[PDB]
Write a protein that binds this ligand. Structure first.
Ligand SMILES: [Zn+2]
Ligand SMILES: [Zn+2]
Ligand SMILES: [Zn+2]
Lengths: 176, 79, 96, 57, 48, 126, 49, 234, 122, 47
RNA sequence: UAUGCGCAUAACGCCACAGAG
DNA sequence: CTGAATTAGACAATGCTCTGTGGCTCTAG
């Protein structure tokens, strides 16, 4: 339901046997607003929350949680004519780095003729195409784990139009 | 090391200190002084310079590449 | 919105390119000497080809898909049949 | 590799990432702030096969 | 180049592989960078 | 220094007469060679602002953005209107209509002459 | 006066010379926080005379 | 000074460049002399623009009051490009209302093309108007527009090459529909274009061209016809 | 004797095979940091021009008349000559070595090799 | 209703000109014609 | 980019003369 | 039998900003 997860000691360790929630400390670059000269932690947390659920090729994945916000150096680099102060951050992330053809699990929204949207970790509205041209009788007579929970494969990943790393992967039953 | 440059703020430094600080007060940076009805960020930045309440560090680069750091609190401002 | 540049040029160097490096940079071999057809559009394989940039806001690009306001512009090359000198280096070629 | 002429946008499948055409790596591309006449300058020097290499640090 | 005979100095800079450190007042205004004299000899740092 | 009351009486008052020669062949080259000044009757872009020949009245004033002339395509029917793009309010002085050298030309060359007031202001040179 | 009001996402709301109703509606809409667009970094800019 | 020795020195490079690029690659210099006039259909194989799947069986109407309703009467200025109300005279000969012709009454596809062409480059519309045939909408958004990145989003745009492609395909349709005798100036009146465009498209149909302004005083006060091509049958 | 650019390229390549250790320091443009044969004599010659982007070469129209700028005109004057040489090398092909026309007779010659005059023109 | 009167430059005779007809004076054939000024309200300030 | 109401129209150089300070 | 100074030719530069109008930009073969 797009509910914001806490860091929750690495998101209650949702780096399970299948879903790749690898955790590693990283450095990011932050253009802090000048209204946050005091309350720098608030502005850093706000810009990191703006960074969440968006794919970063530098982080090689999609961040879902951050902790240990540490500032590198006590000097903030005000550049020439701009107002934003640029400070270099150090934080420990929990990121989501998927692959083509690998295993994931999801909690479904709908199962239509050709749209199955399964929530991966409660944030990622990952859509699944239901028919894979093997039969049209597999639409009825469920047999595709049509429950609250579902496990699936990914063939391609393309970001959504507004603030979401979308995942477009077919169901890929192991038999048939 | 010992800072071996001028204890006075030069005229080129107070222009850029007032420019940077008025650009900060142009955003919603908190004002360290009491606004007596000013609406110009330059006048507020001049009151903050006069009250020694600007925290910015001037990094005076020497022509080899070396520098030394001065706050505006530890520079001698004049008229 | 957000200031997209915060990097900064520290220096600039002038040199020449290898021809392999331009042939990687070029996106279209330009062949047709006729710029525009009868119907006004730019030609294929001409000097105003859309694999380069658009020259105005009325069209889009072929290599990227952006319009005139976001296309950087793209290099093309006229593959000469035979070798000519480089006029930048012709004096030093004469001396060598 | 220090080149304005080298970045290029991917044809869409979205993603909208750039690739250096030279070194074929998408990691090293970032924005600078130049005059537009500097871009016209580096394009017209590329027309004479003159390479302009930027030190972007 | 910005003074005179820009093509000859361009040709020499291309032959020799010349480097410009972008500290001249002309070279800072070609590439759109703040000139080192005056209010540009120094930088301002914000203490964290 | 000029006396204000002398300037308010007739001292050194002037005019400038601008003549704009409008040719529908030379400028408006769209094709078909059949453009004539005129209005499509019932056009809300020219109502009480251009005359029935698509051409302003001779007493008329011209502010910015007023309809300056109207011309209609005879083989199509579509009427176009052209707007007054100068920033100075003028008064139409005369409109002369021209033929070709034979008297066989059609209603497509015209020469509007407009009067701009230009009384002495602050900043004028004597 | 003011020629236009630049919004927080870079979109330029041009003020209308004709009706005061639009300019009253814009003047009410100044100083409001970050809207439904996810750009909270800035405030509006008024291009005043 | 040179000699015939310069002829030998240049002939060495000639015999070199004949090698490493063969004689077939040199006879292939006959490319790009007249390659193709771009952004319109090929000169042969006249079966274009109407594939045998998704033929016209979609949103059909029938009345002579529907013929009277070109201006959409009431008690809404006009809803058509009115070339269909010109071709309706030829359509009325097999049947006055809903003629099942061998042209399959595909003039509504030409109508949808003109409705798409006049609609500008900015399209919020996932479906165009009513937008009932979705495979037709797929073909339009595949062949008659150009996709474009804009701030992480995507928008289909109609470039000048695309606007010329739509117009040239409307020409190719209305030529075989109206039996090679078409009134281009009706398209000039209803679709807001210039006559330089239609004269240059007439130049673009260079093969077997002979045009004459046939009907004079055909309208109430004006003369308008051009578009005689006199081609072999499709 | 005339020295063709394809022969001067071979002369520089042999000269560079011998004396390149020294001439890499007089010409330091290509291939940064200067070790193991960085500069090369191939930049003295052009196998292709570079067409700059079309947004830097705009046509200036004013009411139903296009006007090309000078850059596109000089590139076109190269390109028409390129087409002419390519047809002439096609004519030296399949001759002393189908679908021919012999229409190209506009350059200056009294021989078959107009390649000399058309080289100097290019 | 209210024809467009044009005045010849030489003979000063009044000429009605429609859109399609060639412009020349119906009496003397002269080429320049001046538009007639008609009665219509324009407001000026006496200042 | 400008005007007008997202839509419609208009999207320039080179010479030579003349002038202002 | 070749380095030598000299002399003619080539070439590059020659203040700043601003306002207008008018002709031509592919006519000749
Ligand atoms: Zn592009
Ligand atoms: Zn690279
Ligand atoms: Zn008369």
């Amino acid at each position: 339901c797009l509910e914001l997860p806490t860091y929750a000691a690495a998101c209650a360790l949702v780096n399970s046997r299948y879903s790749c929630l690898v955790a590693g400390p990283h450095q990011r670059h932050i253009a802090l607003s000048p209204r946050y000269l005091n309350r720098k932690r608030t502005g850093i947390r706000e810009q990191l929350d703006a960074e969440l659920l968006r794919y970063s090729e530098s982080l090689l994945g999609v961040p879902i949680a951050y902790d240990n916000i540490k500032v590198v150096g006590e000097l903030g680099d005000i550049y020439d004519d701009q107002g934003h102060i640029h400070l270099n951050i150090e934080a420990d992330f929990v990121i989501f780095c998927p692959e083509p053809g690998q295993k994931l699990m999801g909690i479904v929204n709908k199962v239509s003729s050709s749209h199955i949207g399964c929530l991966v970790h409660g944030c990622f509205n990952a859509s699944i195409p239901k028919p894979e041209q093997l039969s049209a009788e597999q639409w009825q007579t469920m047999e595709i784990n049509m429950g609250d929970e579902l496990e699936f494969e990914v063939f391609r990943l393309d970001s959504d139009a507004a603030g979401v790393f979308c995942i477009r992967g077919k169901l890929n039953i192991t038999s048939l | 090391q010992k800072r071996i440059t001028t204890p006075y703020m030069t005229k080129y430094e107070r222009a850029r200190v007032l420019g940077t600080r008025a650009l900060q007060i142009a955003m919603c940076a908190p004002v360290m002084v009491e606004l007596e009805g000013e609406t110009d960020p330059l006048l507020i930045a001049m009151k903050e310079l006069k009250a020694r309440k600007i925290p910015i560090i001037i990094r005076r680069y020497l022509p080899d590449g070396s520098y030394e750091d001065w706050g505006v609190d530890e520079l001698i401002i004049t008229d | 919105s957000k200031n997209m540049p915060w990097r900064r040029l520290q220096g600039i160097s002038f040199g020449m390119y290898s021809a392999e490096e331009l042939k990687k940079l070029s996106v279209k071999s330009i062949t047709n000497p006729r710029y525009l057809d009868s119907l006004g559009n730019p030609s294929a394989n001409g000097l105003y080809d859309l694999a380069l940039g658009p020259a105005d806001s009325k069209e889009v690009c072929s290599t990227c898909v952006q319009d005139f306001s976001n296309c950087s512009g793209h290099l093309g090359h006229i593959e000469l049949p035979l070798t000519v000198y480089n006029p930048l280096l012709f004096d030093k070629l004469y001396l060598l | 590799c220090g080149s304005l002429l080298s970045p290029l946008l991917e044809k869409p499948p979205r993603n909208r990432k750039y690739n250096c055409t030279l070194c074929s790596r998408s990691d090293t591309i970032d924005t600078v702030s130049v005059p537009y006449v500097f871009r016209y300058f580096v394009a017209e020097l590329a027309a004479m096969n003159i390479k302009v290499k930027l030190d972007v640090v | 180049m910005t003074f005179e005979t820009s093509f000859q100095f361009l040709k020499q800079a291309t032959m020799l592989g010349s480097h410009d450190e972008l500290r001249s007042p002309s070279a800072c205004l070609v590439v759109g960078k703040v000139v080192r004299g005056g209010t540009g000899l120094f930088e301002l740092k914000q203490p964290l | 220094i000029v006396n204000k009351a002398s300037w308010e009486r007739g001292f050194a008052h002037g005019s400038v007469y601008k003549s704009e020669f409008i040719d529908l062949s030379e400028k408006i080259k769209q094709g078909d060679s059949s453009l004539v000044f005129g209005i499509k009757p019932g056009d809300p872009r020219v109502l009480q602002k251009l005359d029935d020949d698509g051409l302003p009245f001779i007493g008329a004033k011209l502010q910015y953005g007023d309809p300056y002339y109207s011309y209609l395509n005879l083989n199509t029917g579509e009427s176009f209107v052209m707007y007054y793009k100068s920033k100075e309010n003028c008064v139409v002085d005369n409109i002369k209509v021209c033929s070709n050298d034979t008297g066989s030309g059609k209603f497509k060359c015209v020469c509007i002459t407009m009067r701009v007031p230009r009384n002495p202001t602050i900043g004028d040179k004597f | 006066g003011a020629s236009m009001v630049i919004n927080e996402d870079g979109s330029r709301t041009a003020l209308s010379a004709v009706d005061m109703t639009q300019r009253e509606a814009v003047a009410k809409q100044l100083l409001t926080p970050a809207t439904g667009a996810p750009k909270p970094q800035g405030t509006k800019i008024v291009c005043r005379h | 000074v040179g000699n015939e020795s310069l002829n030998r020195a240049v002939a060495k490079a000639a015999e070199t460049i004949i090698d490493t690029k063969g004689v077939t690659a040199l006879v292939s210099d006959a490319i790009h002399n007249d390659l193709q006039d771009d952004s319109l259909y090929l000169p042969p194989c006249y079966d274009d623009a109407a594939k045998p799947e998704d033929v016209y069986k979609f949103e059909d109407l029938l009345s002579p009051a529907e013929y009277e309703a070109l201006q959409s009467p009431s008690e809404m200025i006009e809803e058509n490009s009115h070339c269909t109300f010109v071709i309706e005279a030829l359509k009325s000969l097999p049947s006055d209302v809903e003629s099942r012709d061998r042209q399959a009454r595909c003039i509504w596809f030409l109508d949808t093309l003109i409705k798409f062409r006049a609609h500008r480059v900015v399209k919020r519309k996932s479906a165009l108007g009513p937008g009932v045939p979705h495979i037709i909408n797929t073909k339009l958004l595949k062949h008659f527009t150009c996709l474009t990145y804009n701030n992480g989003r995507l928008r289909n745009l109609i470039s000048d090459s695309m606007k010329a492609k739509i117009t040239a395909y409307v020409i190719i349709l209305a030529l075989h529909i109206h039996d090679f005798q078409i009134d281009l100036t009706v398209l000039q009146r209803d679709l807001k274009l210039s006559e330089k465009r239609m004269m240059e498209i007439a130049k673009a149909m260079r093969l077997k061209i002979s045009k004459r302004r046939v009907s004079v005083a055909a309208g109430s006060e004006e003369d308008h016809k051009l578009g005689t091509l006199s081609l072999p049958l499709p | 004797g005339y020295l063709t650019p394809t022969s001067a390229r071979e002369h520089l390549s042999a000269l560079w095979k011998n004396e390149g250790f020294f001439l890499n320091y007089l010409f330091s443009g290509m291939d940064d940091d200067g070790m193991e044969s960085r500069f090369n004599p191939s930049v003295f010659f052009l196998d292709f021009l570079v067409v700059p982007p079309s947004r830097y070469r705009p046509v200036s129209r004013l009411g139903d008349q296009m006007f090309t700028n000078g850059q596109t005109v000089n590139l076109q004057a190269v390109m028409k000559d390129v087409v002419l040489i390519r047809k002439l090398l096609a004519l030296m092909a399949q001759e002393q070595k189908i679908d021919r026309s012999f229409l190209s007779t506009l350059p200056g010659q009294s021989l078959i090799d107009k390649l000399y005059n058309i080289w100097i023109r290019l | 209703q209210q024809p467009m009167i044009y005045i010849c430059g030489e003979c000063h005779t009044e000429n009605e000109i429609k859109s399609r007809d060639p412009i020349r004076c119906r009496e003397c054939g002269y080429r320049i014609m001046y538009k007639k000024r008609t009665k219509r309200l324009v407001v000026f300030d006496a200042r």
